[PDB]
């Protein structure tokens, strides 16, 4: 319980032809 | 002779008057190492982000 922490993260590369 | 030759005229004793009524040892401690003043083992709680 460090107050959770820095959690800046979500989806990566939705690239390709789409 | 005549009266008044007290053989054991004496007041032995009388030594002690009211001694210690307890001496109040261990009188006041309030040891109480610690107090109110909530602490939280965690950190950064109710806030992160």
Nearest CA in chain A to B49: A6
Nearest to B40 by CA among A15, A2, A18: A2
CB contact set of B43 (below 8 Å; sequence gap of 6+): A1, A2, A3
Cα–Cα distance for residue pair B3/A12, rounded to 1 Å: 128
CB contact set of A5 (below 8 Å; sequence gap of 6+): B44, B48
Q: What is the stated resolution of the deposited model, in angstroms?
A: 9.8
The answer to whether A2 and B44 have CB atoms below 8 angstroms apart is yes
Q: Do B44 and A7 touch (CB under 8 A)?
A: no
DSSP letter assigned to residue A9: -
Q: Experimental technique used?
A: cryo-EM
Q: Do B43 and A7 touch (CB under 8 A)?
A: no
Nearest CA in chain B to A7: B49
Q: Do A3 and B41 touch (CB under 8 A)?
A: no
């Amino acid at each position: 319980a460090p107050g959770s922490q820095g959690a800046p993260g979500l989806q990566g590369a939705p690239g390709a032809p789409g | 002779g005549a009266p008044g030759a007290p053989g054991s005229q004496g007041a032995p004793g009388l030594q002690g008057a009211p001694g210690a009524p307890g001496s109040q040892g261990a009188p006041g401690l309030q040891g109480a190492p610690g107090a109110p003043g909530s602490q939280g083992a965690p950190g950064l709680q109710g806030a992160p982000g």
